[PDB]
């Protein structure tokens, strides 16, 4: 058969390229049931509706999109964002968990509204002046995955709560007091992820308790993997929420006022200049040949 449109060849060609082959190619080098029956009944009703048919032919139909979002929510798609941004590799050394509790967080700004914290969202450090609102007996931890200034694997806590009764977070132990974001300048977008871990039994995390207030980076540094490994028996993550933050004026305030340190500033480091090595005695070297080699020409 011959493709009657370019797309037919393109779609097959695109699919063909994606699939691996024995010959070398670029990619290898560089790379419940009851509910459905109820759903089917709605389809018949929706299709039968004469008004809906008229709207379709009149191209005037509309949708309550807000309902779609709630019904769509979500576990499988929520995992994609966390994995896509590299939370799992940095936070659990590659362990991947499907979030089952629809965790949602927002940074409270003033009193009129609270800034959402989507998956992959961008929130300025200024807007994060105060701690955010997070919505059985579980725990909850805050992380600065790439906000660390000295060690790559290490990361800093904003605030860590343990033994959170049911859902109410006010009763959780404030092991780590809240700290505003402090992303270094020149490093682009820093990803901060919010993790919710199922707590099988209430356990005193004396090891993770930190002085309140604490303004030392030497004690804020920690590792999620080893911390989770120590509690991995009773800890199974289920909630995810992470945003990106750039440098901002508030960051200077955080680094100086309470962190009490000079603001970190970074940029791509260029290689040392390349210098040709001329010969001390240019034996049998004319000026015309040296003229091309030297700057003058």
Partner 1 sequence: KENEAVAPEFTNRNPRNLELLGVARKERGWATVWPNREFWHRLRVVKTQHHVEAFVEHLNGQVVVSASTREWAIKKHLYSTRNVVACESIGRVLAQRCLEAGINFMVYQPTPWEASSDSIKRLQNAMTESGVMLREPRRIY
Partner 2 sequence: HLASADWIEEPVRQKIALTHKNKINKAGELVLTSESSRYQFRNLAECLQKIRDMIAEASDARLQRLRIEKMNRERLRQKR
> What's 190's DSSP letter?
E
C-beta of 297: minimal distance to partner 2 in Å? 11
141 binds, among partner 2, partner 1, none (CB under 5 to 8 A by kind): none
Nearer to partner 2, 32 or 280 (CB): 280
249 binds partner 2 (CB under 8 A): no
Contact pick of 91, 106, 160, 245 for partner 2 (by CB under 8 A): 106
Residue 251 contacts residue 181 (beta carbons within 8 Å): yes
118 binds partner 2 (CB under 8 A): yes
C-beta of 57: minimal distance to partner 1 in Å? 9
122 binds partner 2 (CB under 8 A): yes
Chain breaks in the chain (C to N over 2.5 A) after: 31, 73, 135
Nearer to partner 2, 206 or 296 (CB): 296
Binding site for partner 1 (CB under 8 A): 5-7, 18, 31, 39, 42-43, 46-47, 49, 52-53, 55-56, 59-65, 67-72, 77, 80-81, 84-86, 90, 118-122, 145-146, 148-152, 184, 186-191, 215-218, 244, 255, 259-262, 264, 266, 269
Beta strands in the chain (DSSP E): 105-109, 113-117, 121-122, 133-134, 138-142, 155-156, 160-164, 173-176, 190-199, 221-222, 235-245
C-beta of 129: minimal distance to partner 2 in Å? 16
Instruction: Report the alpha-carbon distance of residue 237 to residue 144 in Å, rounded.
Output: 17
C-beta of 116: minimal distance to partner 2 in Å? 3
Instruction: Report the alpha-carbon distance of residue 280 to residue 134 in Å, rounded.
Output: 71
Q: What is each CA distance from 154 to 32, 219, 240, in whole angstroms? A: 43, 11, 20
* Cross-strand partners of 245: 190
Q: Which residue has the tokens 């063909």?
A: 16
23 binds, among partner 1, partner 2, none (CB under 5 to 8 A by kind): none
C-beta of 91: minimal distance to partner 2 in Å? 22
Nearer to partner 1, 96 or 278 (CB): 96
Instruction: Report the alpha-carbon distance of residue 295 to residue 15 in Å, rounded.
Output: 53
234 binds partner 2 (CB under 8 A): no
Angle (CA) 219 222 224, round 5°: 155
């Amino acid at each position: 058969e011959k493709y009657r449109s370019f797309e037919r060849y393109r779609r097959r060609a695109e699919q063909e390229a994606r699939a691996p082959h024995w010959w070398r190619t670029y990619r290898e080098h560089f790379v419940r049931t009851q509910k459905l029956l109820e759903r089917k009944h709605f389809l018949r009703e929706l299709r039968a509706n004469v008004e809906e048919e008229r709207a379709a032919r009149l191209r005037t139909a509309s949708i309550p999109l807000e309902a779609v979002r709630a019904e769509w929510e979500g576990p499988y798609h929520k995992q994609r964002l966390a994995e896509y941004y590299g939370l799992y590799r940095d936070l659990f050394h590659g362990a991947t968990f499907v979030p089952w509790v629809p965790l949602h967080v927002a940074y409270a700004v003033g009193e009129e509204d609270l800034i959402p914290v989507y998956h992959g969202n961008e929130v300025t450090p200024t807007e994060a002046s105060r701690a955010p609102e997070v919505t059985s007996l579980w725990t909850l931890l805050f992380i600065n995955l790439d906000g660390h200034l000295l060690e790559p694997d290490a990361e800093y806590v904003h605030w860590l709560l343990t033994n959170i009764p049911s859902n109410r977070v006010a009763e959780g132990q404030e092991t780590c007091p809240y700290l505003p974001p402090f992303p270094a300048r020149g490093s682009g977008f820093h990803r901060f992820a919010f993790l919710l871990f199922k707590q099988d039994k209430p356990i005193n995390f004396s090891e993770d308790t930190r002085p309140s207030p604490c303004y030392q980076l030497a004690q804020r540094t920690f590792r999620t993997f080893d911390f989770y490994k120590r509690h991995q028996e009773a800890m199974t993550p289920a909630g995810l929420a992470f945003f990106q933050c750039r440098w901002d004026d508030s960051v200077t305030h955080t680094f100086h006022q309470l962190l009490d340190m000079r603001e970190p500033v970074f940029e791509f480091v260029r290689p040392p200049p390349y210098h040709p090595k001329q010969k001390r005695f240019p034996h049998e070297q004319p000026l015309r040949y040296l003229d091309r080699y030297r700057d003058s020409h």
